[PDB]
Design a protein around this ligand. Structure first.
Ligand SMILES: [Cl-]
Ligand SMILES: [Cl-]
Ligand SMILES: [Cl-]
Ligand SMILES: [Cl-]
Ligand SMILES: [Cl-]
Ligand SMILES: [Cl-]
Ligand SMILES: [Cl-]
Ligand SMILES: [Cl-]
Ligand SMILES: [Cl-]
Ligand SMILES: [Cl-]
Ligand SMILES: [Cl-]
Ligand SMILES: [Cl-]
Ligand SMILES: [Cl-]
Ligand SMILES: [Cl-]
Ligand SMILES: [Cl-]
Ligand SMILES: [Cl-]
Ligand SMILES: [Cl-]
Ligand SMILES: [Cl-]
Ligand SMILES: [Cl-]
Ligand SMILES: [Cl-]
Ligand SMILES: [Cl-]
Ligand SMILES: [Cl-]
Ligand SMILES: [Cl-]
Ligand SMILES: [Cl-]
Ligand SMILES: [Cl-]
Ligand SMILES: [Cl-]
Ligand SMILES: [Cl-]
Ligand SMILES: [Cl-]
Ligand SMILES: [Cl-]
Ligand SMILES: [Cl-]
Ligand SMILES: [Co+2]
Ligand SMILES: [Co+2]
Ligand SMILES: [Co+2]
Ligand SMILES: [Co+2]
Ligand SMILES: [Co+2]
Ligand SMILES: [Co+2]
Ligand SMILES: [Co+2]
Ligand SMILES: [Co+2]
Ligand SMILES: [Co+2]
Ligand SMILES: [Co+2]
Ligand SMILES: [Co+2]
Ligand SMILES: [Co+2]
Ligand SMILES: [Co+2]
Ligand SMILES: [Co+2]
Ligand SMILES: [Co+2]
Ligand SMILES: [Co+2]
Ligand SMILES: [Co+2]
Ligand SMILES: [Co+2]
Ligand SMILES: [Co+2]
Ligand SMILES: [Co+2]
Ligand SMILES: [Co+2]
Ligand SMILES: [Co+2]
Ligand SMILES: [Co+2]
Ligand SMILES: [Co+2]
Ligand SMILES: [Co+2]
Ligand SMILES: [Co+2]
Ligand SMILES: [Co+2]
Ligand SMILES: [Co+2]
Ligand SMILES: [Co+2]
Ligand SMILES: [Co+2]
Ligand SMILES: [Co+2]
Ligand SMILES: [Co+2]
Ligand SMILES: [Mg+2]
Ligand SMILES: [Mg+2]
Ligand SMILES: [Mg+2]
Ligand SMILES: [Mg+2]
Ligand SMILES: [Mg+2]
Ligand SMILES: [Mg+2]
Ligand SMILES: [Mg+2]
Ligand SMILES: [Mg+2]
Ligand SMILES: [Mg+2]
Lengths: 172, 172, 172, 172
């Protein structure tokens, strides 16, 4: 047992490793979206940059779980980072819809980790999630939802002029 | 009778209390519009902020009537602030149309208070209204009318692209 | 169901609307106290300004609940803002006593909302209350209690010199 | 007839001269109060300075009526400035009570001049009074009333400690 370990259940340690992997999976999905929107036959560079920034954010979320694991005396165990579910993302609306579902998947995993930490009576892990993860997820979900509403209003997927307008006034 | 009171008719004092309540009612209506445009399924944040600012302005108009009442030696009497007439505001045009009618309602109440002050021969109250309230009402009514004209030109309520364009170039 | 909604119980959504209304009710009560202390026959302007500031604070607390409701995908539903329980507040001690009970009423409502969020297993709402509301309530309750102790020590309600001294050295 | 004169009734011209004299009479009364509070056996120097400042203000009000008279083509006609009604002013409360009645006397004269200007249909004179005189009178009356309330609360005229406290915290 690590000399620093105190009130840290093996189940929580394992779930933190799984959460780290999911953050990395999300980062990789966002990077795929960045690459898609940078294609010469897609060419929506403000949209591409939005997804690149989200890729960076998710990787930082992962690094923070690595640091957390070590601080508590757990051991980081890495697994393969699976490739994204799609190779091409259609258009800005389709990609934002996919991002919304990904953010809700991540949020559900965070909520499930919080349930586990509650069951094992780990207030440090609970507060870490509450103060460092759950509010940013809710903010990101709201932002992406707002974008989806606007893209539908702009006539996506059919209205290419609307798609151009979005790239030029909403993510600039 | 208050030691400061001079040339202040009971009827005017009461009408000032009623005017205070109407300013508060208007502030609350605008706050409702702010909340509607901040919804994830509406998502027009520059429009929401316009209404939030107008909510603030109306509350300041109310505070100034409270201060006026005390300066003249009248007594502030508060009543319930009624909830807005609608829970949802449709779209930017529908909301601006509602705001125009609200501003005209407030302006009519100010004009009616001025008639009363004239009848009771209260030049201080008349000038307060003339110099602190009536010109801002006319300016606000003109601004909202100009917005309505533009929203109709942009094809509201049917044209969602027009609604997006307005939010991005007229209230930014 | 809103596209952003996740782990947000209808009961919590409704209780957030009720909490918003209570914050607005508190703001309105404080504004009444401001107006009372600004009267020419009361004339304690540092006390009036203290209550005006608290009125502002409470309105900001309400706006933050509106924003919260939308972020979670709930719908803001407004009700009448009831007028304050009194039209006149007696003196500085009587008003501070009323403010203490109002702040404890608000705090009890926050604690009850936290119980509901706990029962429905909503850690985001729990942390929002814990980190954005509960500590400010405890601080405000302590400040007002400290003022009450000082006002009693100064001989309120009978000792007018004490009341003047308080206005000039404790809320300046 | 003056070459500049237009829509200026002889009655209004005469009433402006009488108003000028009353402003000068008020200035002189305030100067008497300044001198009283500067006496070695009274010795309330912040109170004395308050009245000195009001003396200055009233003299400026008079000069502005002189300038007004000439601008309209009327002729300034001066009369004796009568000495104040009292040679000694008792104490801070007695003096503030006298100042309140003086300010209300001046305000009544301004309101009466406004009635005359209304009857003779002189909008320039009406607006001059409304915008340059009536609001300052209401503000001054409110301030002095607030002081009277505080002086009574402090136990004047009997409570000398209260009188000292006022001079040190309310007019400093
Ligand atoms: Cl352990
Ligand atoms: Cl274990
Ligand atoms: Cl972050
Ligand atoms: Cl696998
Ligand atoms: Cl694919
Ligand atoms: Cl997903
Ligand atoms: Cl966070
Ligand atoms: Cl009156
Ligand atoms: Cl009356
Ligand atoms: Cl304004
Ligand atoms: Cl009713
Ligand atoms: Cl409705
Ligand atoms: Cl209306
Ligand atoms: Cl003006
Ligand atoms: Cl105005
Ligand atoms: Cl839900
Ligand atoms: Cl539910
Ligand atoms: Cl706050
Ligand atoms: Cl009811
Ligand atoms: Cl009452
Ligand atoms: Cl209460
Ligand atoms: Cl807090
Ligand atoms: Cl003439
Ligand atoms: Cl004539
Ligand atoms: Cl002046
Ligand atoms: Cl004589
Ligand atoms: Cl005498
Ligand atoms: Cl007099
Ligand atoms: Cl003025
Ligand atoms: Cl002291
Ligand atoms: Co993200
Ligand atoms: Co993440
Ligand atoms: Co990093
Ligand atoms: Co595979
Ligand atoms: Co995310
Ligand atoms: Co936080
Ligand atoms: Co984010
Ligand atoms: Co407005
Ligand atoms: Co208004
Ligand atoms: Co204000
Ligand atoms: Co109703
Ligand atoms: Co308005
Ligand atoms: Co003007
Ligand atoms: Co305005
Ligand atoms: Co408060
Ligand atoms: Co509050
Ligand atoms: Co605010
Ligand atoms: Co009622
Ligand atoms: Co409070
Ligand atoms: Co907890
Ligand atoms: Co917490
Ligand atoms: Co904190
Ligand atoms: Co506070
Ligand atoms: Co004066
Ligand atoms: Co004067
Ligand atoms: Co001069
Ligand atoms: Co004589
Ligand atoms: Co005066
Ligand atoms: Co004017
Ligand atoms: Co003015
Ligand atoms: Co003055
Ligand atoms: Co002191
Ligand atoms: Mg283990
Ligand atoms: Mg936003
Ligand atoms: Mg009455
Ligand atoms: Mg304009
Ligand atoms: Mg429900
Ligand atoms: Mg628990
Ligand atoms: Mg303290
Ligand atoms: Mg003549
Ligand atoms: Mg004052």
């Amino acid at each position: 047992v690590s000399q620093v370990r105190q009130n840290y259940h093996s189940d929580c340690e394992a779930a933190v490793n799984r959460m780290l992997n999911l953050e990395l999976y999300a980062s990789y999905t966002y990077s795929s979206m960045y690459a898609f929107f940078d294609r010469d036959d897609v060419a929506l560079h403000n949209v591409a940059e939005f997804f690149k920034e989200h890729s960076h954010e998710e990787r930082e979320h992962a690094e923070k779980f690595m640091k957390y694991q070590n601080k508590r005396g757990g051991r980081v165990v890495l697994q393969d980072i699976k490739k994204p579910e799609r190779d091409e993302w259609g258009n800005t609306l389709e990609a934002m819809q996919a991002a919304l579902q990904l953010e809700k998947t991540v949020n559900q995993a965070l909520l499930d980790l919080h349930k586990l930490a509650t069951d094992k009576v780990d207030p440090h892990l609970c507060e870490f999630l509450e103060s460092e993860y759950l509010e940013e997820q809710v903010k990101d979900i709201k932002r992406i939802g707002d974008f989806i509403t606007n893209l539908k209003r702009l006539g996506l997927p059919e209205n290419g002029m609307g798609e151009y307008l979005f790239d030029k006034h909403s993510v600039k």
